[PDB]
Short mmCIF file of C-alpha atoms and ligand atoms in Angstrom, two decimals:
data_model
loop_
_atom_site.label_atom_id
_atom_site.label_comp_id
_atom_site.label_asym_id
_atom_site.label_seq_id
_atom_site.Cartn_x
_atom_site.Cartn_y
_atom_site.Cartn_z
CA UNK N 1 45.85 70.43 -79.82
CA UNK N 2 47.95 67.51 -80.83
CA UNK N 3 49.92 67.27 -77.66
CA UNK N 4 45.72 67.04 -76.28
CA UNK N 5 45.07 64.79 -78.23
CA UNK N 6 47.47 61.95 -77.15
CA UNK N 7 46.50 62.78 -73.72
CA UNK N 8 42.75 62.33 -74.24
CA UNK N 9 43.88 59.18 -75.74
CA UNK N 10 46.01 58.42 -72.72
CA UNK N 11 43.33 58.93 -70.73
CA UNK N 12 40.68 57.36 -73.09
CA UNK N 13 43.03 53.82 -72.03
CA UNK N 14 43.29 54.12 -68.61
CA UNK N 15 39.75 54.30 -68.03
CA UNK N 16 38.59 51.42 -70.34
CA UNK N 17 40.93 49.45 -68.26
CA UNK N 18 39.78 50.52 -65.26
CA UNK N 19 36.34 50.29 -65.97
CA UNK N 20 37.26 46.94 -67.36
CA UNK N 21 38.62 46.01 -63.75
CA UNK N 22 35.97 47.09 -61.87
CA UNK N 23 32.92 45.37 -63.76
CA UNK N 24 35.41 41.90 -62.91
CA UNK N 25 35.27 42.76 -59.15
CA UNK N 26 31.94 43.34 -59.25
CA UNK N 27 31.33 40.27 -60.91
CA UNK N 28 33.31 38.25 -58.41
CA UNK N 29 31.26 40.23 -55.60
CA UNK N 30 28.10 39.09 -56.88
CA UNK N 31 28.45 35.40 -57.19
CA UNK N 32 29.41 36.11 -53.34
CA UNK N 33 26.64 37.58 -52.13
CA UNK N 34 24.47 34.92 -54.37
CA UNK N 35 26.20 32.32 -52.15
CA UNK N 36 26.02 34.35 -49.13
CA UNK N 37 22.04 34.88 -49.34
CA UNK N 38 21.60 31.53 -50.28
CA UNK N 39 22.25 30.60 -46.89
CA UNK N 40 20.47 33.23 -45.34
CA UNK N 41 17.33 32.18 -46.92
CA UNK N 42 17.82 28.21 -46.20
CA UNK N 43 19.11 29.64 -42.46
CA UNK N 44 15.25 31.73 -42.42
CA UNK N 45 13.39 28.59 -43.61
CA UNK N 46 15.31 26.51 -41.15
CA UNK N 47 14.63 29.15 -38.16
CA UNK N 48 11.20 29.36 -38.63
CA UNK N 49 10.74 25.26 -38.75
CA UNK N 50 12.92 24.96 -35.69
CA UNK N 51 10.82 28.00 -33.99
CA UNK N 52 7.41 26.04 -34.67
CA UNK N 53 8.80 23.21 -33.44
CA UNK N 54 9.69 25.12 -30.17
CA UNK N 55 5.83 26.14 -29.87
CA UNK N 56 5.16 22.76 -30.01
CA UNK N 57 7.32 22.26 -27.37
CA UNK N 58 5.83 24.34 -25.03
CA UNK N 59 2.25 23.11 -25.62
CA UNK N 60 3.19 19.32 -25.12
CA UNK N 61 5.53 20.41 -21.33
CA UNK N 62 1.73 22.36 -20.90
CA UNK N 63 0.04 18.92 -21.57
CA UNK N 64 2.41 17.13 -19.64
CA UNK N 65 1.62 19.31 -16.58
CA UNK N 66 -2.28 18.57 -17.23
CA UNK N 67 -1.89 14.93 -17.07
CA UNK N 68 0.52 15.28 -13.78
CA UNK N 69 -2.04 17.49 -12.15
CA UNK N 70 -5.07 14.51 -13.04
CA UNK N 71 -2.69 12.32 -11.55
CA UNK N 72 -1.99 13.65 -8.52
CA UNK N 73 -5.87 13.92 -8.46
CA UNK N 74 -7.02 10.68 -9.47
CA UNK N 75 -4.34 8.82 -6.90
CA UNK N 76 -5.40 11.43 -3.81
CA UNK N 77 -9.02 10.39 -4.04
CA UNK N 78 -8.64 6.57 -5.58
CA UNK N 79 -7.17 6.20 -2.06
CA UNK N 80 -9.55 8.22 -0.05
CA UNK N 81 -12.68 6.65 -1.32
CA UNK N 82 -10.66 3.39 -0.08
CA UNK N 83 -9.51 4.95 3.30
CA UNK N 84 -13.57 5.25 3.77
CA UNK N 85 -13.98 1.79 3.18
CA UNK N 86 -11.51 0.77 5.79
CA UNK N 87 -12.89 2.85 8.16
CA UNK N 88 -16.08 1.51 8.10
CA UNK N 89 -14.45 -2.40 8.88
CA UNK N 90 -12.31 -0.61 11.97
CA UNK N 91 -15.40 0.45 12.98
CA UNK N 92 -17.02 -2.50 12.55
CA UNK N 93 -14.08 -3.70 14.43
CA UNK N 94 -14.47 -1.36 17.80
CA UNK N 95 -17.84 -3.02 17.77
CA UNK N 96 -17.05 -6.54 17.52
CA UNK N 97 -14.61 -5.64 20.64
CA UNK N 98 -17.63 -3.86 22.51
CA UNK N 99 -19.80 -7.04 22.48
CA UNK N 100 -16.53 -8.81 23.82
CA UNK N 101 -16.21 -6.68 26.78
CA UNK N 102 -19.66 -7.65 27.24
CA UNK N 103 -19.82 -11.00 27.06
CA UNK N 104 -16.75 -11.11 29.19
CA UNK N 105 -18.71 -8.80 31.48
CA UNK N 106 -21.12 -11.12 31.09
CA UNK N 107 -18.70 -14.34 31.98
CA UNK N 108 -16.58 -13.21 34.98
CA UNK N 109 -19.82 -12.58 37.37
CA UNK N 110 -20.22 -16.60 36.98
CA UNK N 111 -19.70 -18.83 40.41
CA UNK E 1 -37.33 -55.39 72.06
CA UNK E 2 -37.12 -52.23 73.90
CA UNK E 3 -33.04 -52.46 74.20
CA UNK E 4 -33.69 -52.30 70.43
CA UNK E 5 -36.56 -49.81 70.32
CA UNK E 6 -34.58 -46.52 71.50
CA UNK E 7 -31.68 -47.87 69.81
CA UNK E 8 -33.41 -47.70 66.36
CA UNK E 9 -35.27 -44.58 66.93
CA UNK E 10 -32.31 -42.90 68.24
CA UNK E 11 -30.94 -44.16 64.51
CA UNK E 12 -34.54 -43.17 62.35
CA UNK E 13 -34.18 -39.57 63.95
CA UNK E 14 -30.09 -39.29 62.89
CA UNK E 15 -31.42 -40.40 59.68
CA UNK E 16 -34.06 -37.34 59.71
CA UNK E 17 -31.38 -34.98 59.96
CA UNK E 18 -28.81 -36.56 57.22
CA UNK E 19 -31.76 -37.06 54.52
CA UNK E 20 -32.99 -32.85 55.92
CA UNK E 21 -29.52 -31.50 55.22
CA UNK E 22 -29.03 -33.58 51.98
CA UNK E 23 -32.08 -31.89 50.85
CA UNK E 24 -30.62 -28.54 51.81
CA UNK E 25 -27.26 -29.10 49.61
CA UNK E 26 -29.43 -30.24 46.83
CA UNK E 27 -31.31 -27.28 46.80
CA UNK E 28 -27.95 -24.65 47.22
CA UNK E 29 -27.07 -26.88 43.97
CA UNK E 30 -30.27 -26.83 42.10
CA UNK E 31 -30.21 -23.13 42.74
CA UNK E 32 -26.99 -22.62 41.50
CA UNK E 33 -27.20 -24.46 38.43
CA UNK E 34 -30.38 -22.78 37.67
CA UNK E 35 -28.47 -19.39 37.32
CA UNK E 36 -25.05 -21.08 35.57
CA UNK E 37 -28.04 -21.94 32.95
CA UNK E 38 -29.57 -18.82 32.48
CA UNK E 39 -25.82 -17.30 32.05
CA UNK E 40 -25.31 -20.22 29.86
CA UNK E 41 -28.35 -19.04 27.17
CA UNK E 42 -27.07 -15.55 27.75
CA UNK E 43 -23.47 -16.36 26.61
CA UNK E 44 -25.44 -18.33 23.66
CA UNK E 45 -27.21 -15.16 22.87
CA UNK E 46 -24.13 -12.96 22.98
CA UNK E 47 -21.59 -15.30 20.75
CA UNK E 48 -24.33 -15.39 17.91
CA UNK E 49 -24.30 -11.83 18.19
CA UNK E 50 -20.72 -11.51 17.98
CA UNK E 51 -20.38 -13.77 15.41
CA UNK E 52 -22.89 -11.85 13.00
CA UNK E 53 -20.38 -8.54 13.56
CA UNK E 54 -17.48 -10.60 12.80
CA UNK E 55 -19.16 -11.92 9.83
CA UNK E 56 -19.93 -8.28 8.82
CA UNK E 57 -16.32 -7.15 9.83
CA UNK E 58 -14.78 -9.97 6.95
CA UNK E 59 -17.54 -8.61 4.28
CA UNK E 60 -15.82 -4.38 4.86
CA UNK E 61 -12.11 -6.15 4.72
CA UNK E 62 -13.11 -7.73 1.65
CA UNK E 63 -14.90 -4.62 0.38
CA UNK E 64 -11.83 -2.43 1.36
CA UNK E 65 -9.36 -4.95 -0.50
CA UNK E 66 -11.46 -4.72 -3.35
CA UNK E 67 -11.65 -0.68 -3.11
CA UNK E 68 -7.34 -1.01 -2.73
CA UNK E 69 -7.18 -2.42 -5.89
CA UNK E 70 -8.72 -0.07 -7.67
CA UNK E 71 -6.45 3.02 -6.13
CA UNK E 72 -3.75 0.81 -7.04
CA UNK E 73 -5.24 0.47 -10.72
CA UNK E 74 -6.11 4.38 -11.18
CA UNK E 75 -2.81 5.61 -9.63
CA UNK E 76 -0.66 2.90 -12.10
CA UNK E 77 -3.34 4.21 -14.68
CA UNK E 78 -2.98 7.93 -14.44
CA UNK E 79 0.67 8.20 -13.83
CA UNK E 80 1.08 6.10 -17.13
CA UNK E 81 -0.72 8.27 -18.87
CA UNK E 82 1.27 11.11 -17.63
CA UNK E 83 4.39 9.25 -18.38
CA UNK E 84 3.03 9.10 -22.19
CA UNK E 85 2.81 12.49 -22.50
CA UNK E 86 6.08 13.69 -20.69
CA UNK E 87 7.66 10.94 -23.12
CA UNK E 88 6.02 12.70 -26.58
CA UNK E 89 8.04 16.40 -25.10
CA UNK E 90 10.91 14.77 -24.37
CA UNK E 91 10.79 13.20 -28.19
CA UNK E 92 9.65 16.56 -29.08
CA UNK E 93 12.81 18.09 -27.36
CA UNK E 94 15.36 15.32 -28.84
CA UNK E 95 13.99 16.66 -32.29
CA UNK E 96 14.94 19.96 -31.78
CA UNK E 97 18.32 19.37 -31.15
CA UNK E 98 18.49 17.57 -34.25
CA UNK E 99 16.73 20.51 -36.12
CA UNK E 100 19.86 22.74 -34.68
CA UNK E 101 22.66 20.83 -35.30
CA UNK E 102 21.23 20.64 -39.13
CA UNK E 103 21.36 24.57 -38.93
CA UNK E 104 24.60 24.40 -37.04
CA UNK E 105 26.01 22.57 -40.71
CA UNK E 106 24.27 25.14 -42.90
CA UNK E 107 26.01 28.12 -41.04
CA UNK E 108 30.15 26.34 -39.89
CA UNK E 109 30.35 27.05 -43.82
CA UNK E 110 29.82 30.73 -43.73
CA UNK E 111 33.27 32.85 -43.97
CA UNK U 1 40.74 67.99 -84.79
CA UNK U 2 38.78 70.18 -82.69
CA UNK U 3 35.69 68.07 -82.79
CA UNK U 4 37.79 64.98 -82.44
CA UNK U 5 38.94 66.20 -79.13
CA UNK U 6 35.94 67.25 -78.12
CA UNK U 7 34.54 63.69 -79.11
CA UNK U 8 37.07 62.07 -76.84
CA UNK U 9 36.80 64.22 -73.80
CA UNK U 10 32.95 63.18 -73.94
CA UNK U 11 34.21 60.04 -74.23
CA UNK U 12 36.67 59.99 -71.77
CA UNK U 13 33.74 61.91 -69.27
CA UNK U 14 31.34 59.42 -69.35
CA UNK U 15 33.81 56.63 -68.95
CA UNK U 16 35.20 58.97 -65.63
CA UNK U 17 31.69 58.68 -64.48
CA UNK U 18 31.11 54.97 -65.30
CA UNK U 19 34.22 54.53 -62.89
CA UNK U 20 32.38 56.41 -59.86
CA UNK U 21 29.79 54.44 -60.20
CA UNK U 22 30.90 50.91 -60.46
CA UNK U 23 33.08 51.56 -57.47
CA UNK U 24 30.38 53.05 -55.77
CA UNK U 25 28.66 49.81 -56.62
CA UNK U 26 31.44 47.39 -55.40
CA UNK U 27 31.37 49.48 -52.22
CA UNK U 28 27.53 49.41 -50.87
CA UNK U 29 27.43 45.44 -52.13
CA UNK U 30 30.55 44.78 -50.14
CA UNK U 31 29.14 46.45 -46.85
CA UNK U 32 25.96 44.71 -47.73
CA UNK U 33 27.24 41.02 -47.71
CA UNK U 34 29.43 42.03 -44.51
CA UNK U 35 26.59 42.64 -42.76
CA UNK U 36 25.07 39.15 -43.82
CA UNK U 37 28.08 37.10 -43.01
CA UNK U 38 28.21 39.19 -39.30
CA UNK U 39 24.67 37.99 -38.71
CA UNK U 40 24.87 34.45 -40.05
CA UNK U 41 28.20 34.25 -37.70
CA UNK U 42 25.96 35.72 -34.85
CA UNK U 43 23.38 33.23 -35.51
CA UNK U 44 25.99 29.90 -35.30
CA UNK U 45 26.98 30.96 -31.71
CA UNK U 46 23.19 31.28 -30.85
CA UNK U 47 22.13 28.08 -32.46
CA UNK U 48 24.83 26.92 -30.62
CA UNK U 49 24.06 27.94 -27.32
CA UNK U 50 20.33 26.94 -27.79
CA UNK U 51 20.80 23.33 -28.70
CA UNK U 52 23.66 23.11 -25.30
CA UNK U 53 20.36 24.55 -22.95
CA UNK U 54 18.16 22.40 -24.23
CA UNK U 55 20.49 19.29 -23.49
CA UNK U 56 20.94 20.64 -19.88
CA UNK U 57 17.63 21.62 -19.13
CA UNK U 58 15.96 18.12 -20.59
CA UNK U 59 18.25 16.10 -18.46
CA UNK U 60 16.57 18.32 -15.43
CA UNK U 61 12.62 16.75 -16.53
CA UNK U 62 14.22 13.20 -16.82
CA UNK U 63 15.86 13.50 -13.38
CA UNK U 64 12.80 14.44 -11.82
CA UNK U 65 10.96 11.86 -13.72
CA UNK U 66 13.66 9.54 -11.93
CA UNK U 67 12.50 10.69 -8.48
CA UNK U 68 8.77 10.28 -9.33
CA UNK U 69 9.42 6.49 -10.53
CA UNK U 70 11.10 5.72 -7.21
CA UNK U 71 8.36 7.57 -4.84
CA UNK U 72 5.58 5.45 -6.99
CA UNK U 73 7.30 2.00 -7.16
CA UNK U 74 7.50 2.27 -3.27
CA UNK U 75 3.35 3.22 -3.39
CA UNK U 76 2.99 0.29 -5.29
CA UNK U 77 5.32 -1.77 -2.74
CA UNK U 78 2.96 -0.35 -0.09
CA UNK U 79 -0.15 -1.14 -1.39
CA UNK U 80 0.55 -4.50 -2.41
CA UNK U 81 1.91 -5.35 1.40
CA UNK U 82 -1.67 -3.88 2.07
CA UNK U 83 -3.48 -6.11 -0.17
CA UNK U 84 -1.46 -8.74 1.60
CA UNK U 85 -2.26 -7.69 5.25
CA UNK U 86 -6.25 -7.77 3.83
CA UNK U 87 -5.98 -11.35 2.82
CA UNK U 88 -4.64 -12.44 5.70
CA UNK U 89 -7.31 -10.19 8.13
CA UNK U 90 -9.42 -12.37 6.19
CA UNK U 91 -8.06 -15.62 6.38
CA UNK U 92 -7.43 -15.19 10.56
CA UNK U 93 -10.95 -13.82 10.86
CA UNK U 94 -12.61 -16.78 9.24
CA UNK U 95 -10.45 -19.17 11.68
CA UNK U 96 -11.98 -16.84 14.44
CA UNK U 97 -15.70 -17.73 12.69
CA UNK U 98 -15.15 -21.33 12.89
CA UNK U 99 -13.81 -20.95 16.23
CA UNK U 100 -17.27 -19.22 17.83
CA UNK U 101 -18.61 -21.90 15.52
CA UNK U 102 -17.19 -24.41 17.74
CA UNK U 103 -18.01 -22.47 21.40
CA UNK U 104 -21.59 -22.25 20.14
CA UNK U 105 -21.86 -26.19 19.64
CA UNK U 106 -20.00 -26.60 22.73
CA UNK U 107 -23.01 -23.96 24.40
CA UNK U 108 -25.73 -25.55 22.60
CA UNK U 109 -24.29 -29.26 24.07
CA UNK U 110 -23.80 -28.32 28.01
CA UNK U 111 -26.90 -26.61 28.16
CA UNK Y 1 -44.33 -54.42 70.68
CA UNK Y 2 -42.40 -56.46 68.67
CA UNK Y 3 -44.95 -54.61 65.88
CA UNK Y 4 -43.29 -51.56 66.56
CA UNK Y 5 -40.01 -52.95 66.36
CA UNK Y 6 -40.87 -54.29 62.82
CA UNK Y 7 -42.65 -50.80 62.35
CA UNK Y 8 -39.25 -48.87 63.28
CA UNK Y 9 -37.29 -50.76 60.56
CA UNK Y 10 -39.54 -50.10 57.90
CA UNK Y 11 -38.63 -46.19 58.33
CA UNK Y 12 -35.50 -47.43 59.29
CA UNK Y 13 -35.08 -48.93 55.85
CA UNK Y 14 -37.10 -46.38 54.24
CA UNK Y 15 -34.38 -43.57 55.11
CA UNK Y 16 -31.41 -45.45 54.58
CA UNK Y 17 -32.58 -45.64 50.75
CA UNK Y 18 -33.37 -41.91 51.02
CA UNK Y 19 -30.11 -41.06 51.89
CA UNK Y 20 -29.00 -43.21 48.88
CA UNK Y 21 -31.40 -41.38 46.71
CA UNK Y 22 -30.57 -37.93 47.87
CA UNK Y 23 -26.47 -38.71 47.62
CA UNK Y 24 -27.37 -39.83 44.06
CA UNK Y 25 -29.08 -36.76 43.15
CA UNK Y 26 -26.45 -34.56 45.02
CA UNK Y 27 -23.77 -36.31 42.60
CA UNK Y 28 -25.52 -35.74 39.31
CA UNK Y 29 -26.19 -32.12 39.99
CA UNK Y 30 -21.91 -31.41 40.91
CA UNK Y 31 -21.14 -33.56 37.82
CA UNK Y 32 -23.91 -31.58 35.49
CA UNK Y 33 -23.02 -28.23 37.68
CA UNK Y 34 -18.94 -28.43 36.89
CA UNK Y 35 -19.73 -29.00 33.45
CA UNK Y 36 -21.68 -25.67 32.93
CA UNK Y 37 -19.08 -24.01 35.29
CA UNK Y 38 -15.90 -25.46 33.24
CA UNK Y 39 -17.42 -24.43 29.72
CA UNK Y 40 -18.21 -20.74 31.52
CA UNK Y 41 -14.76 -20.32 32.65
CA UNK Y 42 -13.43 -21.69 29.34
CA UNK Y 43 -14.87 -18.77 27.36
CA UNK Y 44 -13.87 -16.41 29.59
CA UNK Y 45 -10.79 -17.01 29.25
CA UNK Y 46 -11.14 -17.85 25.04
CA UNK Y 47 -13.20 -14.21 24.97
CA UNK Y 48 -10.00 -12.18 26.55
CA UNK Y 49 -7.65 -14.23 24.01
CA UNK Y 50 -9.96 -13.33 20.82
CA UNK Y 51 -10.25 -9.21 22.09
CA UNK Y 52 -6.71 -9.23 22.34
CA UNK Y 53 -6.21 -10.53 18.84
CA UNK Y 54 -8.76 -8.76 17.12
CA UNK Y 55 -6.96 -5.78 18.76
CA UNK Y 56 -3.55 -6.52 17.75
CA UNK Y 57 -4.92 -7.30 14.17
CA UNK Y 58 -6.84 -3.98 13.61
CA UNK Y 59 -3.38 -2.15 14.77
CA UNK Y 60 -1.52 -3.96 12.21
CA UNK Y 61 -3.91 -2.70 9.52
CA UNK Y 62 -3.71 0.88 10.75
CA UNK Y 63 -0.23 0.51 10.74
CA UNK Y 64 -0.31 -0.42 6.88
CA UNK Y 65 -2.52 2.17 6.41
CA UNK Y 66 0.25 4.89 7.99
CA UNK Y 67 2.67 3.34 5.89
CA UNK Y 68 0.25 3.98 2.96
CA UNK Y 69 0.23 7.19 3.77
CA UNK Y 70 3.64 7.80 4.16
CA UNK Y 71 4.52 6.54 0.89
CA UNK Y 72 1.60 8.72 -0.89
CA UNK Y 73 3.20 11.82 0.52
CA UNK Y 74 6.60 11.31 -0.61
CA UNK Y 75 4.59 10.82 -3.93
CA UNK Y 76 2.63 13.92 -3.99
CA UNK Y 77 5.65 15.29 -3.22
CA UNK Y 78 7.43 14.16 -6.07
CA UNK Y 79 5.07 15.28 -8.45
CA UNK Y 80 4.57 18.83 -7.29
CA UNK Y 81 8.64 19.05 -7.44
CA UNK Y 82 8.12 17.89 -11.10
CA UNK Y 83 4.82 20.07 -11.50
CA UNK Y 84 7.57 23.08 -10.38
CA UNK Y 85 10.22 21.99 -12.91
CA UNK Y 86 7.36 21.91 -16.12
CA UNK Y 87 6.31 25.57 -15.27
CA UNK Y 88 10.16 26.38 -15.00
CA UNK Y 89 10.58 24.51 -18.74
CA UNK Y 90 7.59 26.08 -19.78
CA UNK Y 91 8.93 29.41 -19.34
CA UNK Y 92 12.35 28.57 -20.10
CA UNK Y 93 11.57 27.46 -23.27
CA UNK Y 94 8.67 30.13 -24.07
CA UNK Y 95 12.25 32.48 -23.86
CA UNK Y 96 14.07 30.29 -26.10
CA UNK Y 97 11.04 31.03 -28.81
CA UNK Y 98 11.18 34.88 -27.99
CA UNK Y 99 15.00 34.85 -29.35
CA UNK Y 100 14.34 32.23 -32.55
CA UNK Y 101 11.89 35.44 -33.20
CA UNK Y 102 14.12 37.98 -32.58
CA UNK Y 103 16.78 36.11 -34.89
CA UNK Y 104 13.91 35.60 -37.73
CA UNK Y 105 13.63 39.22 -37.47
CA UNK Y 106 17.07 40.13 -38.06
CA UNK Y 107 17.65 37.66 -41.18
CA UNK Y 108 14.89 39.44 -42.79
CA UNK Y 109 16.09 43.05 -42.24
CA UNK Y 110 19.73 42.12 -43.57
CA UNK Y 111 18.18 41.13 -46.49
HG1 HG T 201 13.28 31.37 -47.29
HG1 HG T 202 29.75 30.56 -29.51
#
């Protein structure tokens, strides 16, 4: 009874103390994790920004390949519409060279 | 007299013949010349034609210069305005990697 | 004596289960927060990788961008010796005008 | 008698100056008739000169023109290289967005 007695009370110490312990590594493993998801949540606000900014990205390349496409259309037919106005002078030209093989049909019967 | 009368007439008749044959290479020249003129109004004709087409050949060069500016102006044109937008990505892209290397800081911490 | 064993053993029970569960505690939030760290570790290689693609694969647009410049300064070059060649079809062409000019007057005074 | 005598002389005379005349006549019609003839030749000869360099001239146009071409190729070229590397970034980059999603996914759940 006695002799259980000092060994409840044994006991009774140990435990405080250990409980004691534990509640300071807990402590210490909290302020980590604090730290630790304080990150994570700047690192998800700073992931979503920088996958926005990707979307972007991939609208403006889209864009981009718009304005090469007009481009590559407005040059093709800017020169065209030209290439039909220099026809029309070489064919003037193959005329103007006709009327010259006449007239120099014309010339050489002369005595 | 008469020593002088079939002398002269022997000379009149010589005469006859020169002045007939003169008339003869008068007319092979007053035939020829009336051809070399009608040629000559032809050749008139012809040159005023030829110089109308050659006035109409300088007004389609002159047309087709002005038409070669413009292709020059709307290729310069579009391609510039592709260049603008191919420059906004790329600024769009330089961002980015700035945006990473910011998270790269936040996370060389974690341990 | 009785009851104040009985107190202590209660006592030294709920202090036994106190210890369970603080170290069950200390446990689960360590496997927690090394879970975190593995991920935010994971995510510094990734951002990592990202922002080196990026670099590459930009440098791949401004290189072709390169090649475009070239092909269209060389248009330009080619359409400005064009616009040259015009001016000059001009320029010979009016000397040719003046020219039939001059074999007109010359028609008009043998005529 | 001695009247025809006289009467000889008269047409003597009379053909001597038609001779003159018709000589006269003969020499104003080769002058006028070399004349027409020289400016004939002249522009047969001027006509062959001007078809041969309105012929060389609309050559070197065409020429230009080819060159034109050439360079406008090498452009269109260019750009649908370029128009092959934005739909290559496009996609490239769409992937790079797939994974900043994939990564926003897993910072949540390790919360
Ligand atoms: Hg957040
Ligand atoms: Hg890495």
């Amino acid at each position: 009874a006695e002799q259980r007695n000092r060994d409840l009370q044994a006991d009774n110490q140990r435990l405080k103390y250990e409980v004691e312990a534990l509640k300071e590594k807990l402590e210490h493993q909290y302020a980590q994790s604090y730290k630790q998801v304080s990150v994570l949540e700047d690192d998800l606000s700073q992931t979503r920004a920088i996958k926005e900014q990707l979307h972007k990205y991939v609208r403006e390349l889209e864009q981009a390949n718009d304005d090469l496409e007009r481009a590559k259309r407005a040059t093709i037919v800017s020169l065209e519409d030209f290439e039909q106005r220099l026809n029309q002078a070489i064919e003037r030209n193959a005329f103007l060279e006709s009327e010259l093989d006449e007239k120099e049909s014309l010339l050489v019967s002369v005595q």
